[PDB]
């Protein structure tokens, strides 16, 4: 039509503007830096107690307590140092696809096929965990939830939208619309002023929390994006997709910088996380073996192979001391 | 070596004990995934039993607890969440027999059945197939020919021949004949018999699973 042409004309105009800046690749710049060498990580703790598939995990900001979600309707809070279960929360709906731990540590959230994000109060005058709030606006399953503070949470959903919620009032403060496909992951920026969401349209969109608009769209991936993680700097992020390829995108350059792919790897990526430095990219896979990538040289530093099933979730501690990989084999492992 | 950490260990053991007890209780439950390509027959296979995403229906028949998950409300990419029901005891599939002259819908149901039956997650999960609208089907076949949907149908426009043909057409869509079974029932007005059919099919599934676990197959 008169204005449908302009949509595909602007996309070319953007493609040209982001090609003028591609003077040198990231591989060229980091060609003379030294390789990280061979990363050998041994399993330190094995967290057992989940009867069914583990679907999500999140580390606490104190780098000791982690929450994990399983298809059995239990939300277990673990003490990584001693392998002790601090709390076990029975969920009303067992079909939980995501879990988050508050930065303060006072609340945990979970969601899934019920389309509800439930906030659980961990520190109560009684000794039980109680449901603080149940957020219900989403019309599709919740894929990811991330806390901003005690009173603010951002949740992605399978109805192609993302939302910012006020826990006190239970209302959607802001709704992020623009993804054509189901949104599968979120990553909050270190400043918490921006976040990225990866959806099933093979695009990653940068969203600012305060004014609710999409600043940038990244479309390198050839298949559904299942995992997204921000770089520790906050100026880049890495995505994981069903095409068995992880790639790194730069916010400032507005384009893909490098691609992490191997010929032996043909299965999708379920989880993506970065190390404290940002030098190592940790990606979960469906081959039952996690892979460690050199984020600067696109080399595979090492493999973490200790699960008999899909590594559905992955997280690195805020101090960078350990990485936790949860899996469909019902076990969480701590690697160091 | 420990102090108020022994008390923490005791708390951890008490709660993992509760987790083990809860797991045993869940294992006794029979979980059924209810599927279909509309609300044509799903509403009728949930009406008799007494107990937004997933609507769970809990009922008890013959001292056995059943949990039936209706996931029709989830308008989303099925391949992103279908793996959650990998360990379901059986799949209940509902097909309306009157949807062969309506639009395409019978073809759409066959496409859904073929997709669900041959997933990598349901390689060994048996399917309880319900053919609804038995009463309506005879009126349609005495009003219109069955060749509207299946052009290769040689037979009279009678209930038995046409319905047996449709049952064959659905039971011929499964490529995993070596690992799973399709239990076909024509939904009847006597609903004591639909629940009886589900109970019998589930009992057969449990017996086969037990034989697999015991190493006798």
């Amino acid at each position, epitope marked *: 039509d008169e204005l449908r042409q302009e949509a595909e004309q602007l996309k070319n105009q953007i493609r040209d503007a982001r090609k003028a800046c591609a003077d040198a690749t990231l591989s060229q710049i980091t060609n003379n830096i030294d390789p990280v060498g061979r990363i050998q990580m041994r399993t330190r703790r094995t967290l057992r107690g989940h009867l069914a598939k583990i679907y999500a995990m999140h580390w606490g900001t104190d780098s000791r307590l982690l929450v994990s979600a399983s298809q059995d309707g239990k939300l277990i809070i673990w003490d990584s140092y*001693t392998t002790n279960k601090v709390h076990a929360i029975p969920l009303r709906s067992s079909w939980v696809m995501t879990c988050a731990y508050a930065p303060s540590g006072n609340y945990v959230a979970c969601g899934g096929l019920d389309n509800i994000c439930s906030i659980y109060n961990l520190k109560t005058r009684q000794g039980n965990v109680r449901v603080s709030r149940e957020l219900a606006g989403h019309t599709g399953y919740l894929s990811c939830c991330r806390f901003l503070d005690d009173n603010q949470i951002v949740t992605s959903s399978g109805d192609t939208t993302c939302a910012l919620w006020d826990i006190e009032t239970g209302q959607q403060t802001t709704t992020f619309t623009g993804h054509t496909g189901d949104v599968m992951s979120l990553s909050l920026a270190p400043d918490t002023r921006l976040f990225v969401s990866g959806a099933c349209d093979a695009s990653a969109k940068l969203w600012d929390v305060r004014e609710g608009m999409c600043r940038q769209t990244f479309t390198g991936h050839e298949s559904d994006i299942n995992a997204i993680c921000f770089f520790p700097d906050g100026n880049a992020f890495a995505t994981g997709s069903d095409d068995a390829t992880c790639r790194l995108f730069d916010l400032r350059a507005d384009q893909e910088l490098m691609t992490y792919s191997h010929d032996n790897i043909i299965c999708g990526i379920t989880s993506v996380s970065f190390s404290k430095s940002g030098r190592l990219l940790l990606a979960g896979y469906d081959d039952f073996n996690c892979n460690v990538w050199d984020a600067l040289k696109a080399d595979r530093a090492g493999v973490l192979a200790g699960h008999d099933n899909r590594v559905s979730c992955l997280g690195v501690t805020d101090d960078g001391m350990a990485v936790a990989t949860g899996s469909w084999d019902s076990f969480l492992k701590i690697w160091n | 070596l420990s102090a108020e950490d022994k008390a*923490a260990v*005791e708390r951890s053991k008490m709660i993992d004990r509760n987790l083990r007890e809860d797991g045993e209780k869940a294992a006794r439950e029979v979980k059924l995934l209810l599927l279909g390509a509309g609300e044509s027959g799903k509403s009728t296979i949930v009406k008799q039993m007494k107990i937004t995403g997933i609507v769970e229906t809990h009922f008890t028949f013959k001292d056995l607890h059943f949990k039936m998950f209706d996931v029709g409300g989830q308008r989303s990419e099925r391949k992103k969440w279908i793996h959650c029901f990998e360990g379901v005891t059986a799949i209940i599939f509902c097909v309306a027999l009157s949807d062969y002259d309506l639009v395409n819908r019978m073809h759409e149901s066959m496409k859904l059945f073929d997709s669900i039956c041959n997933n990598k997650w349901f390689t060994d999960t048996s399917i309880i197939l319900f053919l609804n609208k038995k009463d309506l089907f005879e009126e349609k076949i005495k009003k219109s020919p069955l060749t509207i949907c299946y052009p290769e149908y040689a037979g009279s426009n009678t209930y038995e021949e046409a319905a047996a043909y449709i049952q064959c057409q659905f039971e011929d869509l499964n490529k995993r004949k070596d690992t799973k079974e399709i239990y076909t029932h024509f939904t009847c007005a006597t609903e004591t018999k639909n629940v009886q059919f589900v109970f019998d099919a589930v009992t057969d599934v449990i017996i086969k699973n037990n034989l697999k676990d015991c190493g006798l197959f």
Partner: single-chain antibody
Amino acid sequence: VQLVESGGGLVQPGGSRKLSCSASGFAFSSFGMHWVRQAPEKGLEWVAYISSGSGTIYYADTVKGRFTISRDDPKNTLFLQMTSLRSEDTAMYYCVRSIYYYGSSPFDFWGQGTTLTVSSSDIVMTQATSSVPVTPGESVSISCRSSKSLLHSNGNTYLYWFLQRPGQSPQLLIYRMSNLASGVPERFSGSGSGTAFTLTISRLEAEDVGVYYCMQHLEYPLTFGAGTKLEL
């Protein structure tokens, strides 16, 4: 949260008595419970402890073999059966709830107490001062000392601080040396070296006078200090 104690009265020496603590307003089954007596015009003394689930029971050497503590989770009641009572058992008995997990505040709630009147290796916690005259608005430091170091290998120094306001049950102020309890103003702060510890009140109020007790939770039996009195 409410703990109500019953069963007290005048008992002849050599007799028996049964004390009941009725828990209300919290998940009683998940909390470990303690009995703490306070003798007339004397300080706090730990008596017994029962874990959540009744798995672990501890008693003081004074009452070991005479007193038995039991729990009723369906009825939310804690019991102390006291046999062969002697006149040293005349005291105020307190029902205390304690939950143990990483980051828990043990000993956070205390009951109002029941009065029992019987007619006629352990770590020593030392509080040097018994009475401090104070005026509102100044900084007060309350010192406590321990026979053995309270710092454990895991990094936790188990020294709890309690305030007993006049005619009231003791209240938890600081847990594990530095952690401030829920609901307590930030005027209070605890710092210690592993064997010598101090409690600082930055600004006084009329609601801060009372006796301040230091307790160790490194090992059983739990021991208290003699108590430091703050007066106007």
